[PDB]
């Protein structure tokens, strides 16, 4: 939707990625796509209305096939409101916090973290900034 944050050197433990923005009015979806070639190592997809239920769907795409979805009902996003998403990389999983509160963790399926060269940021949001640092 369709911005891309380059991750030279790929993903590595201790890396902290921060995304700041504002959810658009009447938002329908948001998506973060950690890409490794044509695969999607980590797909973070907040859905504002899936049968009148809000849900965050996470999955991985390998060789054009989506794997086992990991769903989370806790949904801190709100249409028209600013947000902050922080993705902390651990050797065994991606740690996600929103508005400074832990939200979920997604265990790595794609093991070669170094090959995850970019983070796609899309969906119904107004992007302020996307950056990363080491902690």
Ligand X SMILES: OC[C@H]1O[C@@H](O[C@H]2[C@H](O)[C@@H](O)[C@H](O)O[C@@H]2CO)[C@H](O)[C@@H](O)[C@H]1O
Binding mask 13-52 for ligand X (x = CB under 6 A): ------------------------------x-x-------
Among 69, 78, 90, 126, contact with ligand X (rule: CB under 6 A): 69
Q: Are 124 and 23 in contact, with CB atoms under 8 Å apart? A: yes
Q: Binding of ligand X at residue 108 (CB under 6 A)?
A: no
DSSP codes of every residue in 93-107:
EEEEEETTEEEEEEE
Among 5, 55, 57, 127, binds ligand X (CB under 6 A): 57
Cβ burial of 27 (10 Å; 0-12, 13-18, 19+) is: buried
Residues in the chain: 135
Q: Which residues bind ligand X (CB under 6 A)?
A: 43, 45, 57, 59, 66, 69
């Amino acid at each position: 939707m369709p911005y891309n944050l380059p991750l030279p050197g790929g993903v590595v433990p201790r890396m902290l990625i921060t995304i700041l923005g504002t959810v658009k009015p009447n938002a329908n979806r948001i998506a973060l796509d950690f890409q490794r070639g044509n695969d999607v190592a980590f797909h973070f997809n907040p859905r504002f209305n899936e049968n009148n239920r809000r849900v965050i769907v996470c999955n991985t795409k390998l060789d054009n096939n989506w794997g086992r979805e990991e769903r989370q009902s806790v949904f801190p996003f709100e249409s028209g409101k600013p947000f902050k998403i922080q993705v902390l990389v651990e050797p065994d999983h991606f740690k996600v916090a929103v508005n400074d509160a832990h939200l979920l963790q997604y265990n790595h399926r794609v093991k070669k973290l170094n090959e995850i060269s970019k983070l796609g940021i899309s969906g119904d949001i107004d992007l302020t900034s996307a950056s990363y640092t080491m902690i």
